[PDB]
Symmetry: C3
Amino acid sequence: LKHFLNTQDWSRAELDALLTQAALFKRNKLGSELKGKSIALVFFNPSMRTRTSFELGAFQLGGHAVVLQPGKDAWPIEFNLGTVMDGDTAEHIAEVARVLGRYVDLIGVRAFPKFVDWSKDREDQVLKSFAKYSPVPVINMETITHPCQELAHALALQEHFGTPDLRGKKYVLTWTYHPKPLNTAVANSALTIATRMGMDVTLLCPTPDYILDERYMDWAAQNVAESGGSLQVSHDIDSAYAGADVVYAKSWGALPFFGNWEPEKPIRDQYQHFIVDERKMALTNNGVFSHCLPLRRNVKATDAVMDSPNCIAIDEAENRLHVQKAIMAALV
Amino acid sequence: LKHFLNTQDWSRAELDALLTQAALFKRNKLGSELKGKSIALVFFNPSMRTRTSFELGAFQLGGHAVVLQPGKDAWPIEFNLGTVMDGDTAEHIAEVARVLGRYVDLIGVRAFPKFVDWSKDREDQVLKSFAKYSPVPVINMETITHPCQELAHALALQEHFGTPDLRGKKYVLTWTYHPKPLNTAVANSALTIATRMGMDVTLLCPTPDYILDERYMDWAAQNVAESGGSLQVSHDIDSAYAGADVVYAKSWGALPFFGNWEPEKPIRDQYQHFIVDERKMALTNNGVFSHCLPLRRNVKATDAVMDSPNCIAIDEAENRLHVQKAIMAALV
Amino acid sequence: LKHFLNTQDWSRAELDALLTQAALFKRNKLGSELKGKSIALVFFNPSMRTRTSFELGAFQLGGHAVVLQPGKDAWPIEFNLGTVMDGDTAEHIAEVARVLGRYVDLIGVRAFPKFVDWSKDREDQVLKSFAKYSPVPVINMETITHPCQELAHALALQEHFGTPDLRGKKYVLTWTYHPKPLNTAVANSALTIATRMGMDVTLLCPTPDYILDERYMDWAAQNVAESGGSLQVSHDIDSAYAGADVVYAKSWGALPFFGNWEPEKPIRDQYQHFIVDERKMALTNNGVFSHCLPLRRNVKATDAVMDSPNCIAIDEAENRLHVQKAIMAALV
Ligand SMILES: CCC[C@H](NC(=O)CCC(=O)O)C(=O)O
Ligand SMILES: CCC[C@H](NC(=O)CCC(=O)O)C(=O)O
Ligand SMILES: CCC[C@H](NC(=O)CCC(=O)O)C(=O)O
């Protein structure tokens, strides 16, 4: 059974076919690939874009999406095996995934790490649990990676540059400020897709502490070798932006500080200058800027940068709808 | 771009055409005016009628409605310009409105005032923000005015009296009791539509403190002059009800006490007799009674008054569905 | 007007016709029995299966379901008559049921007892209130009985045994452990449907304190007399399981302790051995096991029992979808 957990699990040809079908769906939005079909959208965390695009995406293809939020409307779910369920969780994922499997044709799931222990969050328990027990394809709506975002980001870049071949472009994935430590998911996905597309990637971040988990640094290396791009870590702002064609910002908490954020606050707090402003975008080769959203103005990027015609954040967000309809159509 | 923020922004002919299309949709509920289309229903406050009628309204016209609740399922939204977003709001309306604009064909929004400062609530920031940044038509689902309610109220009166011309009817908008201070929105809308229809309007309320914001008292005066009706403020119960053809109740907090309700409790508390009962309805010319709902029995109106065949509250509520489908059809 | 509050209110022929239409819908899932129609699903408590199956059920028949949660998105509802509404409830069921009646074609409602007073919970106020004031058919989505579960349970048994005639089978409804006292609804429904089908029913429970309300024990007696089955209460585990063909587990709080659970904790706590494990299922005549779900593993039933091929819990859950589409089709 084929799922959509990570773009890394898919071949370049399949990914390419997906992006092309996404471009096609963008030209003809209404269809019947999901006629009479349905998808269960399971959200363990907030969402505006993902929830809306999937729900409309299912409607436009003749299907229906059922939105569930364990702990809110649906019963809380247990993922650990062989445990005694006398706590807060009412039912086990082994039952939930099989029950949903009898109702829907697809299951999407969103579950952010708990932030208490990266050693456990990095295992991707929820996503893997759904894929293991569900008899129908599973779609990652963001856990420790954000594959749907990757394709919406990629398509937006190919549209911008007028070509599917992004090789040669100087790509800069820069960490940015936020009063609190966030999930690395989007950052991990960005590095994965930028290198998979064969671009010259520079992971700009404050200190070595903010470097992404090895799993993704290695995925990137393997992608560079195969795609013909390059990987580079940097702690110097100006040099990174130098001649960049694309700038993707995202804030996240230093992995080494998981479960012990108190001593991390003072550190991230001394790097508020990482905010993307006009000066930094000026050093780029008339580069394009984007962010996965939700974005906090004058914190992650300035008003001017967001209002800039070089900001393709809205196009990328729109592409979530088209790229996701392509994933669903391919999974059924 | 045409929106539906207030009936005041629309001409009498357009309003008339809307009410007529609403009457038509009521005869033939299923259609295709919204086939393959969608609407984002953004709720910052509770709702039963508005949420249900819009969702069914979209379904019956071939479209789909996506229901969002910032702070609950979707991310919290910032509306102030040029502020530093390091607080509770995760993204700005400038992005949210443009993102939704790429997904849906219509955006409805409901946002009650904060009740801390009428000087700020009266600006209608949320509604104006959506209309300013959205590339698609915006619909007021109640903020400081409740335009959809107005048309559902109007149509229900025209049906009741068997004619679209309400001129000459004695209309009484009476304030009523409630343990807490409420939004003036419905009251402001009632005054606006009753005078716009050319009726003889009497705003009955406890003390001059409970008179509506000048903006609406002036809208009413302009409407009277043009529609051929009349406006009158009153603090005397029996005289107001005298020969009235229509009685519309609604409770609200005295504007002068916004942000300082403590000294208002004792005042509203000494006017519980404003409740609409059989005696007051007896003084009317066999008048009809209604309320926007949700209505608290034996507080705003008595059980007998609600069970009375003169209570057209349920018809008015039903009309929300028909009048709204007419607004959506006209906006797309 | 015909509703679906309890299977007890329906004749055997009607119930049979329902189960058969459910079997038919299972073979042909898409239809038009609810084309252009809609149903309001009112949830006062959590739900995953009921909410999902009804929503998909309505979609598959050409209709649309609007999901409401009073106190969350919709306004809180008052059910007591002639009370003064100055509390937390914003509107009365007399209005809510009539308003919904103008919007939808069907109303489903889920409302668990408050657990403070069984004398009041047993009256089934919410369900009866909806059925009394609504101009459209009402469907019990679980209050003090769970009729939709009953039919999904029944159909699953008829499929398992390859026949609609379950007479002769040894049916065991056993109470099981849970750290907290739960609703008796499912237990009451199980006893009602098992005896209505004419099986040899044994209500196995810890102490006489855990025997179900007389209303249901009497319904069972009347059903036994008519269906040709038998009823029996037991406090002995091994004897009950002896040669059973079906084992249905469910945990619930002792009725006599309603509103005073403190002294009940220690009692239920000394009966954790009621958990359904391999040993007990071994004493059965190769019996089938099921539960309504959500089920807490290694508390109500062990992992082995749930993973056992004799566990038909997932089939029963799937049947909720088919049996409910049959109820809606019959009510419209
Ligand atoms: C279908 C059963 C619904 C509900 N179940 C619960 O309340 C169990 C919840 C828990 O275990 O936390 C009940 O017992 O009536
Ligand atoms: C698409 C990004 C989702 C999420 N974002 C947040 O949690 C930011 C929320 C905030 O700024 O309050 C994240 O960082 O993974
Ligand atoms: C259609 C009216 C919506 C809202 N009503 C309330 O907030 C009343 C709620 C309550 O009585 O608790 C208002 O007054 O504007």
